[PDB]
Amino acid sequence: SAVKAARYGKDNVRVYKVHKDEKTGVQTVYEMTVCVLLEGEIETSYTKADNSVIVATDSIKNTIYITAKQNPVTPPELFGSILGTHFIEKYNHIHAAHVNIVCHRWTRMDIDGKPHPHSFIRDSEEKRNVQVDVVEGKGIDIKSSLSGLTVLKSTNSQFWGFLRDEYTTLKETWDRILSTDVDATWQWKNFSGLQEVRSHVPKFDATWATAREVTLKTFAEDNSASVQATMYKMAEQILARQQLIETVEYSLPNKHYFEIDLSWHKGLQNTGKNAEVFAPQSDPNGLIKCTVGRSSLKSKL
Amino acid sequence: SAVKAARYGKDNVRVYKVHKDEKTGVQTVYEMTVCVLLEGEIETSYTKADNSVIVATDSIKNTIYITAKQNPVTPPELFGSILGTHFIEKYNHIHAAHVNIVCHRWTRMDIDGKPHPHSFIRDSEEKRNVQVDVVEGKGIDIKSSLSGLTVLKSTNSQFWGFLRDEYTTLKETWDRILSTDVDATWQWKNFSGLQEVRSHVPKFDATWATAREVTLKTFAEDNSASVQATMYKMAEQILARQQLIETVEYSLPNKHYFEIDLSWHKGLQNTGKNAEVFAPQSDPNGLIKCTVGRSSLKSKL
Amino acid sequence: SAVKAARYGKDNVRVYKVHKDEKTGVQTVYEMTVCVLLEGEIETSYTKADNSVIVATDSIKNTIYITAKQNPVTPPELFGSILGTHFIEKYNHIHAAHVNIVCHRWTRMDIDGKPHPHSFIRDSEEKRNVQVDVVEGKGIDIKSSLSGLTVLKSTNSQFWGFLRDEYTTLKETWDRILSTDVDATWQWKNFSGLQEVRSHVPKFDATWATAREVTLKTFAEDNSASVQATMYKMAEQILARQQLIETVEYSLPNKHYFEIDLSWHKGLQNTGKNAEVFAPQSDPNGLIKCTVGRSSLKSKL
Amino acid sequence: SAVKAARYGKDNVRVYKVHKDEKTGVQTVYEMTVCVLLEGEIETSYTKADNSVIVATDSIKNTIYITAKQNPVTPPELFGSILGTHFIEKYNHIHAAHVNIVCHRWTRMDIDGKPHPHSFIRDSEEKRNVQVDVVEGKGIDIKSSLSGLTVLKSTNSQFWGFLRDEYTTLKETWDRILSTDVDATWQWKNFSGLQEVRSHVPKFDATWATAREVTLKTFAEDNSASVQATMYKMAEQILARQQLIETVEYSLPNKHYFEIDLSWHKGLQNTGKNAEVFAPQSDPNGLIKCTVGRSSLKSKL
Numbered sequence A, B, C, D: 001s002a003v004k005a006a007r008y009g010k011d012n013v014r015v016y017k018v019h020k021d022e023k024t025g026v027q028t029v030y031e032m033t034v035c036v037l038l039e040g041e042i043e044t045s046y047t048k049a050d051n052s053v054i055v056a057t058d059s060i061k062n063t064i065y066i067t068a069k070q071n072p073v074t075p076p077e078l079f080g081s082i083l084g085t086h087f088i089e090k091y092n093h094i095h096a097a098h099v100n101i102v103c104h105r106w107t108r109m110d111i112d113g114k115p116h117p118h119s120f121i122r123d124s125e126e127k128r129n130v131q132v133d134v135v136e137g138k139g140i141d142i143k144s145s146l147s148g149l150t151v152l153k154s155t156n157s158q159f160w161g162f163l164r165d166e167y168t169t170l171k172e173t174w175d176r177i178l179s180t181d182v183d184a185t186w187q188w189k190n191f192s193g194l195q196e197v198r199s200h201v202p203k204f205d206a207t208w209a210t211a212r213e214v215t216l217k218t219f220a221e222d223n224s225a226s227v228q229a230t231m232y233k234m235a236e237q238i239l240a241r242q243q244l245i246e247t248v249e250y251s252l253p254n255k256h257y258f259e260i261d262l263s264w265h266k267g268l269q270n271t272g273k274n275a276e277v278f279a280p281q282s283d284p285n286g287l288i289k290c291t292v293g294r295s296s297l298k299s300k301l
């Protein structure tokens, strides 16, 4: 036998950081969950009980907290790049660091119409995430995402004109509920190293904000022909607004809300135009995915 | 043997309702999870295989949807009262109905600064709940609550002066993080029936809003001596603002954020006044409870 | 305002203990999650910022680990009684201790047909639990339970003869699937203190084993008329087999498996006698409860 | 813009099937959760609101149940292959089907020492899974796995000789607890189509059983130098026992159990040789991965 692939490290490292402005009194908090997995010349730890090649996962944990103490933790694209770069620079035999960060929301409270200097609310379980792959000799590859953004529209969604054969029971509809949990990912151009990442720092928060804005406005305003058609519109707009991202990926469940025929009970009308009460379905669910990039076709367009 | 207590029914009934204003185009959505459990002269279903006394749980489910079609689903205190009253009135041998409702958030989206007529966001997993116990001959007992309201303050929390003995290792502190998930319950005066509940309908939304407002403002503004002291202040204020509630209950976890001593690494200072990076602890957690009512002591106060 | 009820303590305290027989080499492991909440003369911690009356939750945590080091952790009824007794004896002003223990399964592995001396498998997420309420001057009240015991039978369950009215759509059936997650609780006679608990120690494991055995055999063998009828049979048998328990409680979901009519597709027959493929329903679910005790009726039986 | 990748279908489809032997009375149950995602000439559903190319997810759901009615659901490798093959054969424009199956345990109950003909227990949340990728013109690629197999050994695990630098605090140990949740995957040689899959049907259950047996015995018997070293031994043995699998992958968390120093309390000794009571850590956790294949090195071995 031989080792074909290996990576190891510390997962589920919860990290909080506070910034205190002593002049103004305003405090700002950040909370994340971090995973760092390393690759390199480590195969003998598996094959020969050679622990000399292992940077202990406990040490990786320590390093996450030390790096958070010594650097900004925002934007997460930067923090992840600093953290991954540390491992491949510090350890000659480590050649890749894979850093995943989930950022948790702590939104400043407004009390009596004024932002409070040191109190926060988890205003959504929506996350902002990064996946930062730092590969020695091959730069830094970053995927940024938002996830757990749960939305519903009560009309202006349709689904008709789909294939119908002997496996089909679904009725066409010109007016349905559409609800999803949005997972949207934008993948950046490869960066050559940490200096290039730093050179683009403002673009990270700006592009996350664009992605979120476009997602919400397109969902709300598109009289949707399908999940497929709507998500594509989102992706094409995000690509148009940031030239440093190469692709946009969406993964969207179709969280079904079924009509309830009540006509068996006193002739109650609760379908079609009279549909008011629905049964949300926990499972199963449609699942619709696509990755959108920029065109390179010049004929047969 | 004999049956000492029994109740049965349908749990986890997911319900959506939409209201459409055809004049304005504005749509409003409601989503809940409902449980209804019945009591009455049902013991022979357990002891004698007598199913004649069972209103099938499937029928209870149907009844939840029919009742939602024929009545408002808001405020949940009213919906639960209508629903519970139905069972004890319709079925002579059913003498209590226990209705639990969890209301899920669907907050209207603002798009380009304007409220959208038919698009919504799950802006928090915070819930608004009711427990409505409709007992034949003994009226309607309602407990209203908010739950899953997750908050954090980064300073202006203290904990010192606690008992110290041979089991104690905890350091006193004059400046710590305080974070919790708020579960707050207000219990209403007994109502004689559905007419009395209806007579107080506006008070339900108003009292939920007061409870939420008081919770947030007191959390944010109290330079807290303990979880105990802060929660008591919340409860006393809510009681002062609604004379139809008899008690207020809080159940609050103390979700610990531990300092991380980094002085072993290059003399890094990350404790006390220099504490910036903390380790959120998933478990264990303090758990602090109290039920507050109005005083009746006239001496030794 | 005044404090009407209060309790506080530490929740979610994970505890492992190992026993090592140095003569044989056999090791035995125990893992639990513990909650201890205290009551007593603590109201001034809420009303007056008086922390002197608070035994810190951190200290309660320490005490759980110290007590586990100094005593057996099995049976959990005993451990919980020792632990609760400690708080009301050690602290004059603490007058009740409420101890909840969830015991996690670590079943010894059999390797090549022989029990391994120090390797274990989580063979089920089924739990064994206790609730031990130690109340100064009023002894020790113990509720023991098993929970998360998930079972299914593919026939020999029926449900017919239930009430039928204008809310009813459910078809009678003489052959259905029955599946549940069993939560069964037995409540012991009040014990006067720790000596009386100790005097009955062997009965705890024996009664848990009886409850489990009776549950499984009755589920498997009863040609069930309803969940109600089957659960009652379980309870009556457990009461008959242990005179020191006063009541038995079951709480059982009816986890529905729906037939799927496929006759629209090539005349496929998949209902009634030809039902082979079913759709498990995640929600909603029936929920059926009862508490059974010993009879005291002497007439009209 | 253009579509670079797309797939869509139905997720979270719960499926039960029963087999009834009418001669013997013995019934056997199967329960799974299924996901099927399709690829093909579908880009215009995203770019042009062309629903004609969409086989509705609802129809995919119907097809899962129909296929389960008309075919064996075991082994899952076969069922997934039949199901995926159906989509690429039935629909000219569909060119890949990605089928994921999670199989849930229903183990026959033994009652009074005899296997019961129609009653079952969920004896573990451990799963058996498959990922079957059916790609037109490129056969069938199958990955089989077991997951959620939670184990612990109380001794005969070590971790010493790891890299030590200025980021390291971890103590070397020659005797620790080792606990994990095993996720083990074996990837089969590419199969040319459904006939080749069928030709190897007995190997699927046999190889799952080997993987499980090897996992448990190696975990129990290896005096482990590290998670890395132990998992490699598992993988090499599985490869040696089935020539039709090309690689074996393990993904193992190191679920830490920390010693508790109690020497501050009455000199209690609970470390090293006297360690009996430990604190299981929910997070963070080590995470150790490797993919093992057969060697092809002929020099510098």
Ligand SMILES: *O([O])[C@@]12[N]C(=O)N([C])C1=NC(=O)[N]C2=O
Pocket (backbone or CB within 6 Å): A159, A170, A225, A226, A227, A228, A254, A285, A286, A287, A288, D008, D054, D055, D056, D057, D058, D059
């Ligand atoms: O995804 O869920 C489908 N299949 C289906 O049955 N639907 C009702 C869907 N709606 C869609 O928007 N697209 C789609 O492919």
Ligand SMILES: *O([O])[C@@]12[N]C(=O)N([C])C1=NC(=O)[N]C2=O
Pocket (backbone or CB within 6 Å): B159, B170, B225, B226, B227, B228, B254, B285, B286, B287, B288, C008, C054, C055, C056, C057, C058, C059
């Ligand atoms: O609850 O968690 C405690 N015990 C304790 O150790 N603490 C740090 C606490 N803080 C409090 O506010 N109150 C309390 O009783």
Ligand SMILES: *O([O])[C@@]12[N]C(=O)N([C])C1=NC(=O)[N]C2=O
Pocket (backbone or CB within 6 Å): B008, B054, B055, B056, B057, B058, B059, C159, C170, C225, C226, C227, C228, C254, C285, C286, C287, C288
């Ligand atoms: O509980 O789920 C019911 N109601 C119902 O509709 N059922 C199919 C049930 N089966 C039962 O065993 N009992 C019962 O009351």
Ligand SMILES: *O([O])[C@@]12[N]C(=O)N([C])C1=NC(=O)[N]C2=O
Pocket (backbone or CB within 6 Å): A008, A054, A055, A056, A057, A058, A059, D159, D170, D225, D226, D227, D228, D254, D285, D286, D287, D288
């Ligand atoms: O993985 O958790 C480590 N790092 C570490 O700190 N450990 C205690 C580990 N034990 C291991 O078996 N391997 C490893 O790399």
